[PDB]
Design an enzyme around this catalytic site. Sequence first.
Site, PDB file in Angstrom:
ATOM      1  CG  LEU A   1      -9.778  39.657  11.628  1.00 57.61           C
ATOM      2  CD1 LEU A   1      -8.980  40.855  11.904  1.00 57.61           C
ATOM      3  CD2 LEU A   1      -8.777  38.551  11.795  1.00 57.61           C
TER       4      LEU A   1
ATOM      5  CD  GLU B   1      -4.697  45.779  13.887  1.00 59.52           C
ATOM      6  OE1 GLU B   1      -3.458  45.669  14.200  1.00 59.52           O
ATOM      7  OE2 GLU B   1      -5.288  45.003  13.060  1.00 59.52           O
TER       8      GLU B   1
HETATM    9  N1  LIG Z   1      -4.037  38.650  13.350  1.00 61.16           N
HETATM   10  C1  LIG Z   1      -5.070  37.934  13.372  1.00 61.16           C
HETATM   11  O1  LIG Z   1      -6.080  38.178  14.272  1.00 61.16           O
HETATM   12  C2  LIG Z   1      -5.005  36.766  12.375  1.00 61.16           C
HETATM   13  C3  LIG Z   1      -6.138  35.998  12.309  1.00 61.16           C
HETATM   14  N2  LIG Z   1      -6.133  34.872  11.428  1.00 61.16           N
HETATM   15  C4  LIG Z   1      -7.397  34.094  11.440  1.00 61.16           C
HETATM   16  O2  LIG Z   1      -6.910  32.751  11.958  1.00 61.16           O
HETATM   17  C5  LIG Z   1      -7.703  31.699  11.219  1.00 61.16           C
HETATM   18  C6  LIG Z   1      -6.883  30.815  10.227  1.00 61.16           C
HETATM   19  O3  LIG Z   1      -5.948  30.209  10.999  1.00 61.16           O
HETATM   20  P1  LIG Z   1      -5.678  28.755  11.375  1.00 61.16           P
HETATM   21  O4  LIG Z   1      -7.100  28.103  11.572  1.00 61.16           O
HETATM   22  O5  LIG Z   1      -4.654  28.659  12.435  1.00 61.16           O
HETATM   23  O6  LIG Z   1      -4.850  28.267   9.997  1.00 61.16           O
HETATM   24  P2  LIG Z   1      -3.587  28.410   9.005  1.00 61.16           P
HETATM   25  O7  LIG Z   1      -3.700  29.596   8.226  1.00 61.16           O
HETATM   26  O8  LIG Z   1      -2.336  28.284   9.646  1.00 61.16           O
HETATM   27  O9  LIG Z   1      -3.903  27.235   8.027  1.00 61.16           O
HETATM   28  C7  LIG Z   1      -3.750  25.814   8.407  1.00 61.16           C
HETATM   29  C8  LIG Z   1      -3.594  25.035   7.115  1.00 61.16           C
HETATM   30  O10 LIG Z   1      -2.332  25.645   6.461  1.00 61.16           O
HETATM   31  C9  LIG Z   1      -1.413  24.712   6.158  1.00 61.16           C
HETATM   32  N3  LIG Z   1      -0.265  24.831   7.152  1.00 61.16           N
HETATM   33  C10 LIG Z   1      -0.250  25.588   8.305  1.00 61.16           C
HETATM   34  N4  LIG Z   1       1.022  25.452   8.794  1.00 61.16           N
HETATM   35  C11 LIG Z   1       1.839  24.786   7.935  1.00 61.16           C
HETATM   36  C12 LIG Z   1       3.198  24.381   7.863  1.00 61.16           C
HETATM   37  N5  LIG Z   1       4.193  24.657   8.766  1.00 61.16           N
HETATM   38  N6  LIG Z   1       3.551  23.633   6.778  1.00 61.16           N
HETATM   39  C13 LIG Z   1       2.701  23.299   5.797  1.00 61.16           C
HETATM   40  N7  LIG Z   1       1.455  23.633   5.828  1.00 61.16           N
HETATM   41  C14 LIG Z   1       0.987  24.355   6.900  1.00 61.16           C
HETATM   42  C15 LIG Z   1      -2.072  23.334   6.504  1.00 61.16           C
HETATM   43  O11 LIG Z   1      -2.657  22.970   5.346  1.00 61.16           O
HETATM   44  P3  LIG Z   1      -2.726  21.618   4.646  1.00 61.16           P
HETATM   45  O12 LIG Z   1      -3.731  20.763   5.366  1.00 61.16           O
HETATM   46  O13 LIG Z   1      -3.199  21.958   3.261  1.00 61.16           O
HETATM   47  O14 LIG Z   1      -1.381  20.932   4.603  1.00 61.16           O
HETATM   48  C16 LIG Z   1      -3.164  23.620   7.549  1.00 61.16           C
HETATM   49  O15 LIG Z   1      -4.331  22.728   7.592  1.00 61.16           O
HETATM   50  C17 LIG Z   1      -8.819  32.445  10.532  1.00 61.16           C
HETATM   51  O16 LIG Z   1      -9.779  32.701  11.569  1.00 61.16           O
HETATM   52  C18 LIG Z   1      -8.259  33.841  10.183  1.00 61.16           C
HETATM   53  O17 LIG Z   1      -9.274  34.917  10.269  1.00 61.16           O
HETATM   54  C19 LIG Z   1      -5.071  34.410  10.516  1.00 61.16           C
HETATM   55  C20 LIG Z   1      -3.957  35.277  10.662  1.00 61.16           C
HETATM   56  C21 LIG Z   1      -3.880  36.412  11.565  1.00 61.16           C
HETATM   57  C1  LIG Z   2      -8.993  38.588   7.787  1.00 64.69           C
HETATM   58  O1  LIG Z   2      -7.632  39.211   7.866  1.00 64.69           O
HETATM   59  C2  LIG Z   2      -7.155  39.980   6.811  1.00 64.69           C
HETATM   60  C3  LIG Z   2      -8.032  40.721   5.980  1.00 64.69           C
HETATM   61  C4  LIG Z   2      -7.523  41.485   4.926  1.00 64.69           C
HETATM   62  C5  LIG Z   2      -6.147  41.531   4.667  1.00 64.69           C
HETATM   63  C6  LIG Z   2      -5.274  40.835   5.510  1.00 64.69           C
HETATM   64  C7  LIG Z   2      -5.765  40.104   6.599  1.00 64.69           C
HETATM   65  C8  LIG Z   2      -4.889  39.332   7.363  1.00 64.69           C
HETATM   66  C9  LIG Z   2      -4.391  39.542   8.675  1.00 64.69           C
HETATM   67  C10 LIG Z   2      -4.576  40.726   9.434  1.00 64.69           C
HETATM   68  C11 LIG Z   2      -5.575  41.631   9.324  1.00 64.69           C
HETATM   69  O2  LIG Z   2      -5.446  42.643  10.331  1.00 64.69           O
HETATM   70  C12 LIG Z   2      -4.282  42.309  10.970  1.00 64.69           C
HETATM   71  N1  LIG Z   2      -3.815  43.002  11.997  1.00 64.69           N
HETATM   72  C13 LIG Z   2      -2.609  42.574  12.511  1.00 64.69           C
HETATM   73  N2  LIG Z   2      -2.049  43.352  13.438  1.00 64.69           N
HETATM   74  N3  LIG Z   2      -1.986  41.460  12.142  1.00 64.69           N
HETATM   75  C14 LIG Z   2      -2.585  40.675  11.206  1.00 64.69           C
HETATM   76  N4  LIG Z   2      -1.890  39.567  10.894  1.00 64.69           N
HETATM   77  C15 LIG Z   2      -3.786  41.086  10.562  1.00 64.69           C
HETATM   78  C16 LIG Z   2      -4.587  38.069   6.500  1.00 64.69           C
HETATM   79  C17 LIG Z   2      -3.169  37.661   6.600  1.00 64.69           C
HETATM   80  C18 LIG Z   2      -5.658  36.928   6.586  1.00 64.69           C
END
Ligand SMILES: NC(=O)C1=CN([C@@H]2O[C@H](COP(=O)(O)OP(=O)(O)OC[C@H]3O[C@@H](n4cnc5c(N)ncnc54)[C@H](OP(=O)(O)O)[C@@H]3O)[C@@H](O)[C@H]2O)C=CC1
Ligand SMILES: COc1ccccc1/C(=C\c1coc2nc(N)nc(N)c12)C(C)C
Length: 186
Positions: free
Chosen positions: A22, A30
């Site tokens: 994050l 959160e």
């Molecule tokens: N709420 C929040 O603030 C959230 C934060 N995050 C953060 O975001 C980051 C990770 O995200 P991001 O870099 O976008 O990556 P993703 O989690 O989306 O991962 C991308 C990899 O997943 C596979 N992939 C993604 N989309 C598809 C699809 N439609 N079909 C098949 N495979 C797919 C691909 O893998 P492959 O190459 O193997 O085919 C791709 O290289 C981290 O920083 C994490 O902390 C993540 C979720 C929520």
């Molecule tokens: C490093 O993030 C995590 C750490 C522990 C457990 C789950 C999460 C995730 C996401 C969200 C975390 O706070 C979140 N808050 C919101 N409102 N949405 C989200 N999607 C996340 C996963 C999926 C990577």
Amino acid sequence: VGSLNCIVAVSQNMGIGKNGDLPWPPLRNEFRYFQRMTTTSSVEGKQNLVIMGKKTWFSIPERNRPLKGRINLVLSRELKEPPQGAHFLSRSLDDALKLTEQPELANKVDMVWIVGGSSVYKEAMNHPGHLKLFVTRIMQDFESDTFFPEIDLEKYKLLPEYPGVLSDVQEEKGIKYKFEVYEKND
Ligand SMILES: NC(=O)C1=CN([C@@H]2O[C@H](COP(=O)(O)OP(=O)(O)OC[C@H]3O[C@@H](n4cnc5c(N)ncnc54)[C@H](OP(=O)(O)O)[C@@H]3O)[C@@H](O)[C@H]2O)C=CC1
Ligand SMILES: COc1ccccc1/C(=C\c1coc2nc(N)nc(N)c12)C(C)C
């Protein structure tokens, strides 16, 4: 299968991640909101399904994963089987959603929650049908290297409240944030 939803926390500059973690310090309440919304199933005898990309899966601490009390599905075209601790693997979002209709899942899955990352959010958000976004607005800028896609407010309504979602400003670690829910149906 019940509703399709995205859930995200996003800074003011649209950041959602930096270096696989994050952009902000951990916000305990959160995270508790995220666990509660994704886990709580509206239907007896079912669990919710979380769908995430591969990098999102591996950003969950290796303990911590799978997300407990939810079915965990990972999207990847490289992987040949679900990662250690995951339950399902699909090559595309369309495929994962098709899978929820298979005999194996059709009666097990209530809500579907897309929990990240960027590209998964983008595709869900631009795909026709009834979709909600549960967006936590972190009201500061934070250096990021991954961003939330644009929310087209022509189609996504901001709802004026929602059960189970606090409407006022929250603060943890000196960081103010607020909860929103958007809904489109196209
Ligand atoms: N709420 C929040 O603030 C959230 C934060 N995050 C953060 O975001 C980051 C990770 O995200 P991001 O870099 O976008 O990556 P993703 O989690 O989306 O991962 C991308 C990899 O997943 C596979 N992939 C993604 N989309 C598809 C699809 N439609 N079909 C098949 N495979 C797919 C691909 O893998 P492959 O190459 O193997 O085919 C791709 O290289 C981290 O920083 C994490 O902390 C993540 C979720 C929520
Ligand atoms: C490093 O993030 C995590 C750490 C522990 C457990 C789950 C999460 C995730 C996401 C969200 C975390 O706070 C979140 N808050 C919101 N409102 N949405 C989200 N999607 C996340 C996963 C999926 C990577």
